[PDB]
Amino acid sequence: RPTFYRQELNKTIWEVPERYQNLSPVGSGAYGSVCAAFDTKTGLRVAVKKLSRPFQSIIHAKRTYRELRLLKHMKHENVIGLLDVFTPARSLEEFNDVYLVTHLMGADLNNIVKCQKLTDDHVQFLIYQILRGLKYIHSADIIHRDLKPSNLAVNEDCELKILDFGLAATRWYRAPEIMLNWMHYNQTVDIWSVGCIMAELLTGRTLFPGTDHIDQLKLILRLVGTPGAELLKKISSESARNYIQSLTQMPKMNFANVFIGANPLAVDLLEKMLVLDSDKRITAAQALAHAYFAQYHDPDDEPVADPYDQSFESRDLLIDEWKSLTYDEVISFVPPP
Numbered sequence: 001r002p003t004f005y006r007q008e009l010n011k012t013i014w015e016v017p018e019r020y021q022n023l024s025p026v027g028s029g030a031y032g033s034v035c036a037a038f039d040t041k042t043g044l045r046v047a048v049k050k051l052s053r054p055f056q057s058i059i060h061a062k063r064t065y066r067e068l069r070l071l072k073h074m075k076h077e078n079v080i081g082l083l084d085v086f087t088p089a090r091s092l093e094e095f096n097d098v099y100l101v102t103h104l105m106g107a108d109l110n111n112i113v114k115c116q117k118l119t120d121d122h123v124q125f126l127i128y129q130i131l132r133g134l135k136y137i138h139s140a141d142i143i144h145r146d147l148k149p150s151n152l153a154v155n156e157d158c159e160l161k162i163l164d165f166g167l168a169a170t171r172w173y174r175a176p177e178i179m180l181n182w183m184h185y186n187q188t189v190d191i192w193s194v195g196c197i198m199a200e201l202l203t204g205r206t207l208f209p210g211t212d213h214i215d216q217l218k219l220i221l222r223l224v225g226t227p228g229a230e231l232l233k234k235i236s237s238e239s240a241r242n243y244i245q246s247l248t249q250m251p252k253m254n255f256a257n258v259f260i261g262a263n264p265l266a267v268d269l270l271e272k273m274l275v276l277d278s279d280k281r282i283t284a285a286q287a288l289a290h291a292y293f294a295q296y297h298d299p300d301d302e303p304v305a306d307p308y309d310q311s312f313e314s315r316d317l318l319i320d321e322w323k324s325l326t327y328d329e330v331i332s333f334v335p336p337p
């Protein structure tokens with residue numbers, strides 16, 4: 001057991017071992033607060049996350065076990081992986097703090113579009129890596145649900161890593177079915193997000209930069225028109241169907257007229273991506289196979305995930321029960337070489 005040292009960062013109590021040094025807060029990191037630190041041991045720049053009130057609510061205690069289980073299973077280049085997990089606790093009886101350690105990422109895609117248009121080969125490399133990462137996550141029966149440039153991490157070499165997966169001016173990449181309560185969703189809700197992101201990289205501007213839920217939707221549709229005949233029947237919700245008919249009937253717009261000068265194959269993929277029909281929306285594996293990624297697509301170098309036991313998700317257990325399962329996952333952790 002290493003020696004732990006206490007410090008106060010923006011009125012937060014941080015008790016970390018005698019290896020993580022010069023802790024400086026960076027951003028957010030779902031269900032917690034993130035710090036940039038220097039790991040003695042390896043001599044690397046790492047990211048340290050302190051989970052916020054891990055065992056204070058039923059939703060938190062369940063989410064804490066969920067997050068730790070995900071990080072211990074993720075073994076992929078385009079997916080954030082777990083380097084270390086610690087607690088200032090000696091016994092189960094004093095376990096009320098959880099810390100997660102990962103590699104420190106250079107930047108996020110919110111700055112990688114900020115004020116300049118990207119080259120077509122740059123977009124190709126970024127989107128191919130998002131898709132490769134999503135393919136692996138989806139094969140484990142996990143979906144991001146809140147995919148945005150904020151949780152897409154890049155380094156100096158443009159080597160991408162997906163963050164904050166499987167836990168869920170912000171909802172600008174939200175899919176129409178998981179917003180307008182349409183047909184019982186699938187994994188391609190993330191393909192919609194990939195589509196909105198790809199468009200943003202090429203144009204340099206956000207595709208649907210709404211101000212509220214009503215605006216966001218009018219904007220999505222000022223480009224895909226209104227659902228037509230075969231699709232209007234598929235809509236399950238009695239409430240939201242009243243709004244679709246309330247909207248002025250918009251036609252489907254040509255993506256070549258909005259994405260001017262852009263690669264014809266990039267237009268085709270975006271059109272196969274930004275499909276209102278969740279049933280006909282292209283999958284991560286199918287989108288990798290698309291002609292646009294001819295230079296990068298390798299079926300032999302696009303691995304699928306090992307079986308992920310998610311049976312705990314159907315389990316309704318008490319805080320102290322979830323607290324116990326988490327503690328065993330902290331002590332059973334094998335650090336990667």
Ligand SMILES: Cc1ccc(C(=O)NC2CC2)cc1NC(=O)c1cnc(-c2ccccc2Cl)s1
Nearest residue numbers: 029047049100102104105107108153163164165
């Ligand atoms: C430390 C940590 C803990 C958990 C998760 C995570 O994704 N958990 C979900 C269950 C799957 C991610 C990180 N890791 C980070 O949150 C960051 C690493 N580097 C970051 C960064 C630093 C400076 C500038 C830009 C970035 Cl993107 S944030």
